[PDB]
Amino acid sequence: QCVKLNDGHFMPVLGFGTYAPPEVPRSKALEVTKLAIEAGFRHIDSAHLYNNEEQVGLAIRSKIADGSVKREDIFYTSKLWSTFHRPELVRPALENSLKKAQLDYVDLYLIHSPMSLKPGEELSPTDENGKVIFDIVDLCTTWEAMEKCKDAGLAKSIGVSNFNRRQLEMILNKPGLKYKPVCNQVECHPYFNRSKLLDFCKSKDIVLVAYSALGSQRDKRWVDPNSPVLLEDPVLCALAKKHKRTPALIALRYQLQRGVVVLAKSYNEQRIRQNVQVFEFQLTAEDMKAIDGLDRNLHYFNSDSFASHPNYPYS
Ligand SMILES: NC(=O)c1ccc[n+]([C@@H]2O[C@H](COP(=O)([O-])OP(=O)(O)OC[C@H]3O[C@@H](n4cnc5c(N)ncnc54)[C@H](OP(=O)(O)O)[C@@H]3O)[C@@H](O)[C@H]2O)c1
Ligand SMILES: O=C(O)c1cccc(S(=O)(=O)N2CCc3ccccc3C2)c1
């Protein structure tokens, strides 16, 4: 249950989302990541940003040590945080991610966001007032440093996240390009289905990986809590009842049937296990059309600061 990437590697089509907000104790990532592997997840999505690479890495190691899986059966992703875009910072950031997870390699390393931030030790540098401080970096040079990380074998594959079509074209048309990104990891669910970007990615043999495929964690730091709750949608709920499944499973199956690799975050043992049931049923062509019709140009992620970033991907 994987897709072949444009570099010859293979990515499992269902991935586990490991992000939890800062209020969650760190020991939780370790617990739930083991649970996810135990349920059947083989793709595990982490990032510098998430401040959990130690614990995710330890969960991976634990399931290798206990005999359940081999290193090569797990697809582990991490990501370069936006304070580390300047090229000289990229390999050391990857090496630090590796040290924390205690892995020799990541299966995938992504540029987390095109919205470069001021370098330093803070995740979210802010000035005098409360304002997040931006940087300016030619992301083509960040990409070249990513290429070097694949060539050294530290990342098997390299890709990007939160890129729009123009930003993907920039890399695709870089003079001297060595490796195309294998994927673009983006917000994608039935209220923001990205069909036009999906078609573009497919035209270039770039996989679209969906985040917030279940409608996001709706944390009020990023998401308006009066936005509509994806999983309460009436159409997804009628489909769930028809198939004897749940709205979440309908949302995840949708993505698989359109050629999207889909992530699913849950820190609940029963929901983690429910989500692997996505492989157990199929939606009809008419089911897919109905879900297609939910699209409403809604990105849950919203930030007045980021909206002013020159590399803001939403316009
Ligand atoms: N590249 C980026 O910028 C970026 C952005 C966002 C996300 N991501 C990645 O994508 C992963 C997932 O996206 P996300 O964090 O926004 O969460 P999500 O997958 O959209 O999940 C949203 C909420 O759905 C709930 N849930 C999960 N399975 C369910 C089910 N079977 N039935 C009812 N509810 C269910 C979870 O709550 P519970 O824990 O209570 O189950 C979760 O908090 C992240 O963890 C991260 O790895 C990347
Ligand atoms: O990787 C994630 O799980 C995640 C969680 C919280 C924030 C971010 S972020 O700061 O990288 N960023 C995602 C892209 C985006 C787009 C529009 C508005 C806000 C954000 C936040 C990413």
From Swiss-Prot:
> What is the E.C. number?
1.1.1.-, 1.1.1.210, 1.1.1.53, 1.1.1.62
Q: Which UniProt keywords apply?
A: Cytoplasm, Lipid metabolism, NAD, NADP, Oxidoreductase
Say which species the protein is native to: Homo sapiens (Human)
Briefly state the protein's biological role. Answer: Cytosolic aldo-keto reductase that catalyzes the NADH and NADPH-dependent reduction of ketosteroids to hydroxysteroids. Acts as a NAD(P)(H)-dependent 3-, 17- and 20-ketosteroid reductase on the steroid nucleus and side chain and regulates the metabolism of androgens, estrogens and progesterone. Displays the ability to catalyze both oxidation and reduction in vitro, but most probably acts as a reductase in vivo since the oxidase activity measured in vitro is inhibited by physiological concentration of NADPH.
What is one GO biological process annotated to this record? cellular response to jasmonic acid stimulus
> Mutating R221P: effect?
Decreases in the retinaldehyde reductase activity. 3-fold decrease in the kcat value, whereas the KM value does not vary
The protein here is known as: Aldo-keto reductase family 1 member C3
Q: Name the consequence of K70E.
A: No effect on 17beta-HSD activity
Q: Cite the position(s) of the site with description Important for substrate specificity.
A: L49
Pfam families per record: Aldo_ket_red
Q: Which pathway?
A: Steroid metabolism
One CC-aspect GO term: extracellular exosome
User: Which residues does the Swiss-Prot or TrEMBL record annotate as the active site?
Assistant: Y50 (proton donor)
Q: Which residues bind substrate?
A: H112
